Amino acid sequence: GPRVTVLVREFEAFDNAVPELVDSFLQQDPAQPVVVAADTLPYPPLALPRIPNVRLALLQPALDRPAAASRPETYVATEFVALVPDGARAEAPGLLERMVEALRAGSARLVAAPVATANPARCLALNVSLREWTARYGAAPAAPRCDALDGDAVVLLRARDLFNLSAPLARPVGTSLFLQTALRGWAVQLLDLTFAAARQPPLATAHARWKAEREGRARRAALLRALGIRLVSWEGGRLEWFGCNKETTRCFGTVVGDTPAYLYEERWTPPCCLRALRETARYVVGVLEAAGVRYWLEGGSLLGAARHGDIIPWDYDVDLGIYLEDVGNCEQLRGAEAGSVVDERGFVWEKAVEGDFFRVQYSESNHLHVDLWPFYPRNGVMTKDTWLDHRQDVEFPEHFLQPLVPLPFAGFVAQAPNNYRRFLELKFGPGVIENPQYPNPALLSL
Amino acid sequence: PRVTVLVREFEAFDNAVPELVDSFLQQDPAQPVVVAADTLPYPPLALPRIPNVRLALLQPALDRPAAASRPETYVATEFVALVPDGARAEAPGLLERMVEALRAGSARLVAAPVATANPARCLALNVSLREWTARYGAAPAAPRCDALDGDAVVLLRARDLFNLSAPLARPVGTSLFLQTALRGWAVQLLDLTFAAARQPPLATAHARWKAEREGRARRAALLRALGIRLVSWEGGRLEWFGCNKETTRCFGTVVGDTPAYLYEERWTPPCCLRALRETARYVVGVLEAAGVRYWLEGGSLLGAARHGDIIPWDYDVDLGIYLEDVGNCEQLRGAEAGSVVDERGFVWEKAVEGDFFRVQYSESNHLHVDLWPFYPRNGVMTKDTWLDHRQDVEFPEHFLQPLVPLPFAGFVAQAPNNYRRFLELKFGPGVIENPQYPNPALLSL
Amino acid sequence: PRVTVLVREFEAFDNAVPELVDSFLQQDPAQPVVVAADTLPYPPLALPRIPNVRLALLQPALDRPAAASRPETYVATEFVALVPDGARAEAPGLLERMVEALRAGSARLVAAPVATANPARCLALNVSLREWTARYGAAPAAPRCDALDGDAVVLLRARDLFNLSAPLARPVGTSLFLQTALRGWAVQLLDLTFAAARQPPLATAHARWKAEREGRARRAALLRALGIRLVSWEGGRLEWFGCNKETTRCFGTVVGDTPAYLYEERWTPPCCLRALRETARYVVGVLEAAGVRYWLEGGSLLGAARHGDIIPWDYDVDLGIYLEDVGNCEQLRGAEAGSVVDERGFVWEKAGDFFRVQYSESNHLHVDLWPFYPRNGVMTKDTWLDHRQDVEFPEHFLQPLVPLPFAGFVAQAPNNYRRFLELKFGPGVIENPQYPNPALLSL
Amino acid sequence: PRVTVLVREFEAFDNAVPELVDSFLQQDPAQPVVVAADTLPYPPLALPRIPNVRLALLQPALDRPAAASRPETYVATEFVALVPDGARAEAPGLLERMVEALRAGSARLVAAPVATANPARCLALNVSLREWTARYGAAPAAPRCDALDGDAVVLLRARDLFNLSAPLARPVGTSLFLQTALRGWAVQLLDLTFAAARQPPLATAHARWKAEREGRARRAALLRALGIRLVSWEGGRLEWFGCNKETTRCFGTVVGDTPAYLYEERWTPPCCLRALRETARYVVGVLEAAGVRYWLEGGSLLGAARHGDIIPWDYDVDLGIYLEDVGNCEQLRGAEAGSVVDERGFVWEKAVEGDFFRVQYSESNHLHVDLWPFYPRNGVMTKDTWLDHRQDVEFPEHFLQPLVPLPFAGFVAQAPNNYRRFLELKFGPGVIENPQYPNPALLSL
């Protein structure tokens, strides 16, 4: 009796070799359980053999079906399952259980075998950090032991493992499966077996390939958005973004309780939102230094610069102090008092709700902002005509600004108050640099 | 019992859910409560973080097992009560008597209106997946209903609720009863009432104006997902969710003469048929006014002779015309120069396949009337192009001398005289009396 | 027909709870299961993180609400099945069968043994809070019983289990049935048998011996907290959980002659009585050894005359002795100079004008020796307390003394001691028991 | 009557609870009053036998129902006034003034000092569960406090008080404000003063001595029970409540490189770090004086580079030594022949798990400093046994020629030269700027 169920999820309705795939596996064992899975019934018809061991799983709700019909485990009776991509074929007999023998004998949860197509499976490293909304891929140091595969491969694992994932068949499965299994610390072993390719392989023409790649990329972009992957890095570079940008809204809505939505989801600030924050801070600092306005890193930005030289990973804005008597030297700021100002490079310069301060937004739509806090000396004390509850929003000795010091921050060099360690612990408390904490720990703590 | 209060219908930007949950907890501190949501609501719902009040997030997540998004694993009780936002438990023991109403009656669901601005009404409902249609009406035998509309607390067994394919699809008021009515289950509307919230949600006309449109949006996304194209009510009102002149047609290009919907064991979507009928009416009027001799052909004439309308699985309309008449019509003469978009958006074209014409409903919607030009030979109507259809043949011209009226698709159309033998000559004997799919070798009736 | 599996008895260092929970999830993936612990078990239990499997922590915490430690809040079903570690579901439908039994039968608890090395046997059990005692025995009406010994899956209604005062106190095998037998509930021990775990915990003799060590510690703490100082068995076996030679006595100093335990509607703790009985025995033996003649006095004589033992709420033992004999015994001529700790731990003191022998330097349960001397045939002394029964009496009541069983040994009492007792206490005192101070609190 | 006087802090053997309860009943005979105790107080209190005075026994009992041990069962009013023994109501309406003040303001607790020898004073309090620490100090925003020191009547809503986990744990003056400060609640110290009992309790030195011994005993058990290992006053006058040289360490054998405190959503106990800093300091003092070449290694060097101290969730200290230098240290060269306890109770032993040495804080407390022998082979620093740790690597010996002073855990220790590049090699780029706990792959995250 068979112990593996072949499962086919990656194929296009408009052009596939799924009939050849299924028929190749049935030729080695006519009782072989085989499942083709789809979100809608594929048209043109697949016209698979109408036998009981060949079933087609429709994985979307229907008014006339029971809950079990859209659950893929309903269709698998065996202990193991083989994810076969379209374009693969079974020509050598018995490979399906050399893969189970290797899986049982080995130390990894998944075993894989390349399919001999134009894109044969390559072994990858993969780190998923939901806190940073990032997947980081690279070359696999312990190959053939991988975190993820790229390319065409049959993947075999226990049905109990595959169907306890939250998105077991989400598309592209080559992306979704290894994001789930890598995050669990599971490994996949690229076995030295090769599956033959379809005799007449699918998407032969350039135009067929072009439509398949366009829909695939669309599915991949929706997948990463749905799962909260905003940034995909390969070896730290070749950055692929899936978050906000200059034309969109920012990822998180209006903050309430000084606790943004991402903290309630046990994540930190989305990397697109940090990337836009760094870009805006440099732009503003560049403008102020060209205009001759004395600025200095303030609040959480100074604290992030003093600790690790960047925006704090869970912070949502950038804060700068400025000398009030310098506001006139900036075109953007002197216009910000009369009304909103969109400058030549799309940044919006505004005077605030109330609180006598200046916000500079990344764009008209994306409200990630640098806040500018103007102070004026008052007997050697820096003061403002307004305040907010926050502990670190206080007056302070002006001598902390008499010299200003370079301080690396967010990929450039900015000005900070002299002896910034002491000035930070005045506003925040002793030990702030060495003990990181969330904006509102009474609501949410690290 | 041991009913789990299950909250699904609410908006994250403006709701009454904390006061809802608090009200039930005041009657029973340990009352099991499950709030369901697709994504974690922000700003925070701020429910009591006590073990009997749980929040079930129905989204996929990379760090959660399959069970975390399946709501039946949050419900351990035998009965489950769907409570809408804006309701409230004042009179203690109200759930307890709903359960004993269920065990006594024969209905699988029992229901209690909520005294809000729109308490639940008792309705009838038939669902016809084959025709993509749900028909609501006034309840024949209230307080027994197929469905409800308005705010109600609905109690049923968890095994029954969670054996449905989409138990908590939104809006629940639409989704649940579509699934239960199709199964022949009844909902019993009881003589009990739940109170409204003291501060009901959506107090301002603007928030009262943001819910409906995401509601109407969610409702249209639901009916499309479940294959409901048309909703009708007693009173004649109709709500569409399919084609129109500004979209594409519902189904893609047809392979093997067998459209995709037939493989799904459905027939032609009601919006496609209805575009076809109003396109056939319009083209017939253009051709009559132009002095082009036309007659119903193929499946159109076959459906006319059966019941005076399009064959319910058919995907286009066919008319034959005299080839020597094409010049009489303005749209047909532009067609042989190129594609023509006329006064009311219909698209006239000379076809690439054969030597015939095609009239599309609109630029984006390629439901069409095909015009098959014929010319006489020695009393035999012929054309120079042919399809691999059995009914695509020549025929004696006397069948056209004269034409006879024949009701079709809501209007009177010209048909060949003696159309029974005409149809039998083209289709084979007994065609009128023996309906069959376009390609029985691939998919038969 | 919905049951929550509830796991409470396991050791964090060696358990089979993962196999237990998995086996029930083999029969139903949505089976509700609550694992209950006082602190977070480490090493980690590695349970599935699915909504129908929840780990409930019963101890208070600065960052959790009151509800978080109340276990009824984790259980929404009608029925509850306490399942001990080492058990596992193998047959299907086993908990519905138990549920059918419960509704069909008349017992509020139903139980099926686990096929471990200690399958549950039935047991009788009376609980006497007044006497701080629980008595076990063999069950006459088995399978209808008061308590169980060994491993079983117990099923009852959640409303029954969680209205008990300590529903999950450990060991639950001891704690649960003390509470249900006290209420008069019976447990029915069914035909059926749950299978044992395939890799059962406590494989090594070292591991078992650590589980039994801390299991004995929890049981002692349980009984002490719940007012059970003595566990006795048919056959005579005794388990003590009270005071001894090296502790405090169980109650503080007495005010208004009414000990604390009486205000709790309880009588003298049985360990305190035992201490008094062995001190009376030892002190009598010492006085007899030294030729000092003694006689039961006060409440000791009353209790001896009434039933041959200490009055069950009394807190000391009283002996009259002849003054002129006081020099005969070493311990007491020593007690006149200062406090004397003898070669067996007893503490002889002089105080009043009477002598006191304490059980030990830490345990101040005492025998009071009242020396009497004859003045013209009347037994009198020089200092008097404010008790009716503290009076002179004719010496002929001691000429001669008679043997009277008391506290496990044969004591010496005045002759015609019923008339003697009626002299000091008043008529009918033997057959009309009364608390030491009825003005404050009556019996 | 909307406030229930609750009396919890008193001693059975010496108290003025009778005077306390009678003072309030003279102001209003109906005044709801609850005296709460673990066991029946003896000598008997002899409180008035009326329905509005009730004694609550909070311990579980074999005979009583669950409700009897729940303090909310004994209170049916909206507010509760916690009144300490020694306090006394002399002017009418003081409880009703505290309510109008409680709802006018923004703090959830109000308090009035009692005119004893120890009237309540305003305190600051921060509660760090992850650091198992309770930091006290003078109250910057007085009279708005986080906590109180001394005797006050404290009034709050019963729903607030009785929803905390340990609402009446003793000493209340500590347990309550630990729970309320952690929730970000404030208490406002009002200008109202409750009088002292005419016969104050514990009026002798001996009565006070016994009361203080029990007080300190209950406070010590309360803090360990709630995981407060260290109490501070303005960063000083510390009080420890965790492990030490005479006990076992706080967590015990670490499986999967993940200690128990991580799963409890906390970091390393402060007593366990203090022992580690002490052992590291003592060990390098022995190594420098014995002529042993050492350098910070692993997470100790990383912590020293990041913030100059032990990483707050780390559980030992690691040092690289030169293998050939071991003979120079007497403690080390005794460790191979068997485990060795030295003059100061530190325990030097060869490794169970590999070929390295380990210095434990004491024979009972196994917080330890690991010492890793490396020998020079062909210019690279390498040992022969290895761990499946990522940072257990061979490294070039130039990193040790020379060595650098780096602050660490309160003293100055030796680190490799260019330790940033050193750390980056075995941990990865950005390691100093991007922290993470030891093995976050469990999926219990």
Ligand SMILES: *OC[C@H]1O[C@H](O)[C@@H](O)[C@@H](O)[C@@H]1O[C@@H]1O[C@H](CO)[C@@H](O)[C@H](O[C@@H]2O[C@H](CO)[C@H](O)[C@H](O*)[C@H]2NC(C)=O)[C@H]1NC(C)=O
């Ligand atoms: O079961 C606890 C102890 O009980 C009796 O003393 C004996 O059974 C002992 O064997 C046992 O103590 C264990 O003894 C071993 C070797 O003698 C120690 O290694 C072990 O300590 C742990 O050892 C591991 C390495 O295997 C780690 O070094 C770990 O850091 C260490 N844990 C502690 C807290 O020292 C010891 N077990 C315990 C719990 O101390």
Ligand SMILES: *[C@@H]1O[C@H](CO)[C@@H](O)[C@H](O)[C@H]1NC(C)=O
């Ligand atoms: C993956 O993560 C590990 C652990 O932080 C790190 O050492 C490694 O360099 C990472 N690899 C990639 C390709 O990001």
Ligand SMILES: *[C@@H]1O[C@H](CO)[C@@H](O)[C@H](O)[C@H]1NC(C)=O
């Ligand atoms: C998850 O794994 C368990 C095995 O522990 C198995 O019983 C269960 O069926 C699995 N779930 C699915 C959906 O396959």
Ligand SMILES: *[C@@H]1O[C@H](CO)[C@@H](O)[C@H](O)[C@H]1NC(C)=O
């Ligand atoms: C539903 O169908 C029944 C039977 O076909 C019919 O009698 C009834 O009129 C229909 N109701 C509606 C509202 O269409």
Ligand SMILES: *[C@@H]1O[C@H](CO)[C@@H](O)[C@H](O)[C@H]1NC(C)=O
């Ligand atoms: C329980 O009580 C009855 C008295 O009514 C007694 O006969 C029986 O022996 C007691 N059981 C035990 C075990 O002593």
Ligand SMILES: *[C@@H]1O[C@H](CO)[C@@H](O)[C@H](O)[C@H]1NC(C)=O
């Ligand atoms: C106690 O019993 C009552 C009566 O059945 C019930 O309502 C209540 O929930 C029980 N308490 C529990 C289950 O904690």
Ligand SMILES: *[C@@H]1O[C@H](CO)[C@@H](O)[C@H](O)[C@H]1NC(C)=O
């Ligand atoms: C408590 O924490 C706050 C955080 O802003 C800090 O300002 C204050 O100094 C801290 N107080 C103590 C006593 O630690």
Ligand SMILES: *[C@@H]1O[C@H](CO)[C@@H](O)[C@H](O)[C@H]1NC(C)=O
């Ligand atoms: C806790 O607060 C809730 C708020 O809904 C209240 O119903 C409940 O009674 C409170 N708990 C107690 C023990 O008072």
Ligand SMILES: [Ba+2]
């Ligand atoms: Ba900030």
Ligand SMILES: [Ba+2]
């Ligand atoms: Ba047709």
Ligand SMILES: [Ba+2]
């Ligand atoms: Ba006596």
Ligand SMILES: [Ba+2]
């Ligand atoms: Ba370390």
Ligand SMILES: [Zn+2]
């Ligand atoms: Zn973003």
Ligand SMILES: [Zn+2]
């Ligand atoms: Zn349509």
Ligand SMILES: [Zn+2]
């Ligand atoms: Zn005792």
Ligand SMILES: [Zn+2]
């Ligand atoms: Zn410690």
